[PDB]
Amino acid sequence: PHFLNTPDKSPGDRLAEICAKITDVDIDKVMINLKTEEFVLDMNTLQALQQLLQWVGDFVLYLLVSLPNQGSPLRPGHSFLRDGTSLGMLRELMVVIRIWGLLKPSCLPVYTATSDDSMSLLFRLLTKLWICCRDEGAASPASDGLVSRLQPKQPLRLRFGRAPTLPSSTSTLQLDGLTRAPGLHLGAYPTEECKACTRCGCVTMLKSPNKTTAVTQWEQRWIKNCLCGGLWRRVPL
Amino acid sequence: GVNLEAFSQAISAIQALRSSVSRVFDCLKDGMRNKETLEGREKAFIANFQDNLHSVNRDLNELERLSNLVGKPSENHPLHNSGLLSLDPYSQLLQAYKWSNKLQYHAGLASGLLNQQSLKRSANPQYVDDVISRIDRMFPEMSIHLSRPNGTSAMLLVTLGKVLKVIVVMRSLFIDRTIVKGYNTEDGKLDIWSKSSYQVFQKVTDHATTALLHYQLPQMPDVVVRSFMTWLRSYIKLFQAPCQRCGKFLQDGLPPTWRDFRTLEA
């Protein structure tokens, strides 16, 4: 809905979802297949591409790397996501972010450098994983060997916002009024806390002003109730 | 051949440069933690940058040292490593060298430390004297010679650079009864008991008697005489006087602490 687009036959935002029936590799062909004109809404694209769109750019890579390590002492390792619908939404996000990066040079990083087109390879891998996930089919061959190859670009150590629990299992607990008892990416985390840092109920810990210009849509979305964490909380530095 | 110290200093300087670059780029990875009045991180940044500049300057200065690497390919070390392949099946020789150096240094340090031994008390050879005298005379600018005119007494005489010769008597061990005299002597055909001076070498004779009564060790008289001689050698300059001026009195000398200063100040 961020699209301040031009006239269209019916809901130009829905074409990004209808793009499911497309080719596997070379998203450059898929974009010309679907549409390329009415996907530029604001010339000030430098609002969420470098700061916010890095999340998906790292999450696609972390999901691709987690595939050949099923032997890890964890059922999904970190995450599995073998449903397909989420993978399709990821591919649609990749298409629209490719269009964005074509419109403006502030695209998602190659995460270091030297991809000869890192987005092209990432999209090829996404589609190769997505084809045998779509509608009641087996899943992965050459994909397992391709994900094994790591360019001179791949980082790690993603945030992955989690929430501490309260495991008062079955017996008793003894807390105090203070002295806690031991038993999110839009910046929002320098090396040492130096801002408001308005935490939330579970994981968020987002800053209050956010020091931005035109991404206030997320702010208005988060000022009110949240993902069962609407109880936003202020925590000092 | 003092290039080993320069090489160690250069190694330390390069390690310091690497560590300083690492510290700079690790601190730059962290903004102002908690200032609440003004960002004092700029001070730490400037300090780290100045430290990097200091390390670079230290490396540039150490570059001036290390004149040249001589030939002599390891100084007769290659005998079986670079020699016949049968001979080197060799590390035994290098291991022995290193172990001997370590043992020597460790024993020296242990002796110097245990010099303050907890020995409660002592309860329950006119051939080595010439050898000890020659070994002591082997030092430079310390031409001495013993006469032994009367009995087994070693009535030797020393003279370093000046005509301030010292007729230091001995007793075949724990030499005592010294008398210093400058600018002519030996009257008749032997030494003398003159002790004549200009009210300056009298203080020198007093200090020498104090030293002879000071270095009285329980054993090892050779080390005693060697220490006595290296203590006496300090009188070759007479051009220093800390804690006072150069001419606070007529004379100036009392180096038991290896630093001669004006008398009547200790």
From Swiss-Prot, chain A:
Q: Name one GO cellular component term.
A: nucleoplasm
One GO biological-process annotation of the entry reads: transcription by RNA polymerase II
Q: Which residues form the signal peptide?
A: none
Q: What is the protein's major site of localization?
A: nucleus
Q: Where are the WD repeats?
A: 69-110, 189-228
Question: How would you summarize the oligomeric state and partners of this protein?
Answer: Component of the Mediator complex, which is composed of MED1, MED4, MED6, MED7, MED8, MED9, MED10, MED11, MED12, MED13, MED13L, MED14, MED15, MED16, MED17, MED18, MED19, MED20, MED21, MED22, MED23, MED24, MED25, MED26, MED27, MED29, MED30, MED31, CCNC, CDK8 and CDC2L6/CDK11. The MED12, MED13, CCNC and CDK8 subunits form a distinct module termed the CDK8 module. Mediator containing the CDK8 module is less active than Mediator lacking this module in supporting transcriptional activation.
The entry's function note states:
Component of the Mediator complex, a coactivator involved in the regulated transcription of nearly all RNA polymerase II-dependent genes. Mediator functions as a bridge to convey information from gene-specific regulatory proteins to the basal RNA polymerase II transcription machinery. Mediator is recruited to promoters by direct interactions with regulatory proteins and serves as a scaffold for the assembly of a functional preinitiation complex with RNA polymerase II and the general transcription factors.
Q: Please state what the protein is called.
A: Mediator of RNA polymerase II transcription subunit 16
Organism in which the protein naturally occurs: Mus musculus (Mouse)
Encoding gene per record: Med16
Q: Which residues of the full protein are shown?
A: 553 to 825 of 828
Curated annotation (Swiss-Prot), chain B:
Q: Give the UniProt subcellular location, in the record's own words.
A: Nucleus
Q: Name one GO molecular function term.
A: transcription coactivator activity
**Coiled coil regions, renumbered to chain:** none
Keyword terms of this UniProt record: Activator, Methylation, Nucleus, Phosphoprotein, Transcription, Transcription regulation
Q: What is its main location?
A: nucleus
Q: A GO term (biological process) for this protein? A: protein ubiquitination
Modified positions (Phosphoserine) in chain numbering: S118
> PTM N6-methyllysine: at which residues?
K120
PANTHER family according to UniProt: 34 KDA TRANSCRIPTIONAL CO-ACTIVATOR-RELATED, MEDIATOR OF RNA POLYMERASE II TRANSCRIPTION SUBUNIT 27
Q: What does this protein do?
A: Component of the Mediator complex, a coactivator involved in the regulated transcription of nearly all RNA polymerase II-dependent genes. Mediator functions as a bridge to convey information from gene-specific regulatory proteins to the basal RNA polymerase II transcription machinery. Mediator is recruited to promoters by direct interactions with regulatory proteins and serves as a scaffold for the assembly of a functional preinitiation complex with RNA polymerase II and the general transcription factors.
Q: Which family does it belong to?
A: Belongs to the Mediator complex subunit 27 family.
By what name is this protein known? Answer: Mediator of RNA polymerase II transcription subunit 27
Q: Gene symbol?
A: Med27
